């Protein structure tokens, strides 16, 4: 069963939708939890956005050269949610503020009568939903928000390198130790020195709660966007008088923006059925 009783005259109807795109290298695992409460004057839906966004980190030689090689990597991950229904309002979302901690763990609590809150380090609520994601060396913040939308940016922040502390904008970030190699991968730091968000990808965990005016319409559409913004780091071999060789990085910041996989979902407030309307 996917209907749980949260109190007297209150229940949560649970539904899940799963979609993947080889085109974008994204998996969207969406949880739709319908809040059915007699003591609450509105229809409510808790959306838990999970899945996977591949880093799509690629290493390649620069043109017809042997001494310039490149690394294309995700500077920022994009997580967005929007609605086109005038009768639907975005009431809350998690995370709400700029957060730089390695693990982002937050809880949304629900109490009968339409009361929504956030839990610390515990329950006691009638119903609750929890987010958990790792963002090592990255920072999360809300880029854009209103009553119909919320957009997050999980961007490169601070790194501990062999040359000391580096920002996500440092041109020498990720530059390797093998200038005489012919493999573009060797011009860049090994995977054990790369954060998971660069070597593998991102495992999102985001929450958004929407309120629908009762009887205003049976259906509502939601667009969920998962993607990334790519940077290109070029590592040129040098050359010094003494004879020793080293690598030097130059950067094309925001070389490939909004490499996003957008899925349009249809929700039925009466039957609690989910339909995938379309995608890209």
Numbering used by the authors: 2 to 122, 126 to 284
Quote the study's own text.
With the exception of α-hemolysin, which is homo-heptameric, leukotoxins are bipartite toxins, formed by the non-covalent association of two distinct proteins, a class S and a class F component of approximately 31 and 34 kDa, respectively, into a likely octameric species. Panton-Valentine leukocidin (PVL) is associated with necrotizing skin infections, such as boils, and plays an important role in the poor prognosis of necrotizing pneumonia. Two additional structural domains are also found: the rim domain anchors the protein to the membrane surface, while the stem domain, closely apposed to the core β-sandwich in the soluble form, contributes two β-strands to the pore β-barrel.
LukS-PV mutants Y181A, K182A, Y246A and N248A also had a significantly decreased calcium entry slope, from 65% to 75% of the control (p<0.05, one-way ANOVA). The corresponding crystals belonged to the P43212 space group, with similar cell parameters (a = b∼94 Å and c∼308 Å) and 4 molecules per asymmetric unit. Residues R73, H245, Y246 and N248 are specific to the two proteins, whereas Y184 of LukS-PV is replaced by a histidine residue in HlgC.
